[PDB]
Each structure stands twice: as C-alpha cells, then as structure tokens.
User: Fold this.
Amino acid sequence: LKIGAWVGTQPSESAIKSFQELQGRKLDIVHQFINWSTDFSWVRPYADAVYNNGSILMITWEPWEYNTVDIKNGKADAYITRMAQDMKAYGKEIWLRPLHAANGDWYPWAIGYSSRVNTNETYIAAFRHIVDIFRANGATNVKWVFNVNCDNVGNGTSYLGHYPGDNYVDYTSIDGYNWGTTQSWGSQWQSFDQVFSRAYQALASINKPIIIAEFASAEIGGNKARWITEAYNSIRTSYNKVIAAVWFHENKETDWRINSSPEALAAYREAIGA
Ligand SMILES: *[C@H]1O[C@H](CO)[C@@H](O)[C@H](O[C@@H]2O[C@H](CO)[C@@H](O[C@@H]3O[C@H](CO)[C@@H](O)[C@H](O)[C@H]3O)[C@H](O)[C@H]2O)[C@H]1F
Assistant:
C-alpha cells in the first residue's frame, strides 16, 4: 500500500517536505492537478521536486478547456502532442489521470454533466485518442489511470460505460469522501466501506490494480480519528486490489486535512504505517 496525497497546494519541494514531516513518513505518491492550458514547462519544477524526493508524480489532468467531443475530434491535439513529447523527453514514470470523475455530473467532460455533450462513446474515443497520441510520441513512461467517483451522479452515469479498455489503462481508481453532516443538501456520516464498496465491486471485475486517488473524511457527524484508523484497516483487509491510498489534504468543501484536529492527525500518522 503506497501512501500518497494532494498536499493542499501545488507540490513545491517545500510543500512535499512539509507534508512528509507532518505525516511522519515518506510520501510515496505526490498528487497534482493541472488543466488543459498548462504545458509541461509549468509542471517541470514540481515534477523535479517530486522525483528528487523519490516519489511518483500522479497528475489529474482536467480538460476544463475541451469537452470529450472536442478531444475525440482532435481539436486539442496540438496541446496533447506537445505534452506527450515533453513527458517522453522528461523520461520519468508519471501516472496520468485524465478526464476523471466522468460518472459524476460536476465536470464539463463528465457523462452526467448537464449539457449532455459527453456520452460513453465520446468519452472512450477521447481517452483512447489521448493515449494513442502519447504512444505515437514514445511516452511509454506515462501510466494511464482510469477513474470513477464512488457514486454514479447524474443522468447516464455508470462505473464502466465509459471504460476505454484494458489496452488503454494501467490502473483504475476510485474517489470518494465521508462528507459527515457538513453539506446542507443532507450529507450523512459514512464509513470507508459505505463510501467505497459499490465502486470497488465494479472495478474488482477488471484485471487492473486500483488506486484510491482522492479520499478524506470530515470531522462533523462522527469520529474522524477512528474513521481514519478503520479506513486504512479496511483498505488492507478487504480492498486487496488497492495498491495506493492518496489522501486529499485541503481545507476546502470541509476540513479534509489530516490535521483538521490533533486526534485525526495522530490517527493518520499511525494508520499509514512504516
Ligand atoms: C476530488 O474531490 C474533491 C472533493 O470534492 C474536489 O475538491 C476535487 O476538486 C479538485 O480540487 C483540486 C485541488 O483543490 C483543484 O486543483 C486545481 O487544479 C487546477 C487545474 O485544473 C490547478 O491550476 C490548481 O493549481 C489546482 O488547485 C481541481 O481543479 C478540482 O477539480 C476533486 F478532484
């Protein structure tokens, strides 16, 4: 079980080192989010810091700038091609997670998104197109991460309708959160198992290893410290295809941070292990 995080900001050398110090352990995976108007030259100083630390960089690559119709039709290809050439030249093993949470309704490339422009077909053609361009440019170092949100949210969404095939995927991944009672829509406290079991059952049918790419717990509505202890136990005990757990450390929709309380931090430090 590799331990990773988005550390709440872009992973400069100091942000990586600070989070490592905070959690009392090596970060095996450092997570970054970038959009589709960011070139690799902007990524480079962060990647150099990650690799100099001896970590793997996972990039969630968010095309706010191009929907799946745009992408499948080649309208982003200059930008994709430059990224693939630059990543190949860089040479280091990078985990790339494009077009994530497509079984939700909140990103403009997602199948559930309310413009209705993204379908299983446009999504798969888009994802395959990206991978084809990277392979054409020799970027064998880039490992492809397929993703689902823990719940299917929005019309038309499913765990695998948008799956582009094992020939296009190195890892699958699940994101999900215990929102506790924090959201006025009526969120409730959920254990790790209540959050993740359904998505895991669907992905466990695919012969690829699984990453928990984004997860955290709120403080409100239950005991976050115990939730952390029990979540890592659950991962190790019953989610055996999961090979990495990548916390989402940011005080954002709620205080997802590992140090949202002293008790949560103590639990996290213990749970992640040696
Ligand atoms: C996983 O679920 C999270 C909980 O709901 C949600 O907050 C995450 O949203 C993503 O959050 C990251 C970090 O806040 C954003 O990162 C920003 O990405 C842009 C590139 O698009 C960067 O330029 C910027 O520096 C990053 O902070 C994501 O945009 C956002 O989708 C969700 F992924």
